[PDB]
Chain A
């Protein structure tokens, strides 16, 4: 599993046709873990700003299947 810190990169990987689904995890420290499932690696992005998580959420392309807390 790959940990990605660059949000834009997470967007580009999401726009890649390889990405199949994404998961949103709400941790007790109020972090949102965006886990994007690709062919070979599960790319995770931990965002500390809550509003950043929501503004991240609909910037994800609609075709991608986002999921609630696992």
Chain B
């Protein structure tokens, strides 16, 4: 919000449409889930300093999730306490990425 109206970074790992993006409320990690079935976990750490550009790096690409009717990960949720990710698939499965 303090850098520009245009996006600060653009990321296009996903081979399919990106469904949901969730930022962990406390830990400096965020996740993106798409129809490809893979969830991308990125380390986004923010400084309060004006000169300090936030450091965004990938951390993991979570896989082994089913795809049904060209639908993969629909929603992702971050555990309020630790780095645990709740991934909801199209097969009726919920995955605990610990």
Contacts and interface: CB of A to CB of B under 8 A. Distances in A.
Task: Please determine if A and B sit in direct contact within the complex, based on CB atoms under 8 angstroms apart.
Answer: yes
Contacts of A9: 2-4
Nearest to A9: B4
A56 B4 CA distance: 17
A39 interface: no
Interface string B61-93: 000000000000000000000000000000000
Interface string A1-21: 000001111011000000000
Interface SS, B side: loop
B55 interface: no
Nearest to B8: A8
Nearest to B51: A59
Contacts of A56: 50
B51 A11 contact: yes
Interface of A: 6-9, 11-12, 55-56, 59
**8 pairs of A and B residues whose beta carbons are closest in the complex:** A8-B3, A8-B2, A59-B51, A6-B2, A59-B50, A9-B4, A7-B2, A7-B50
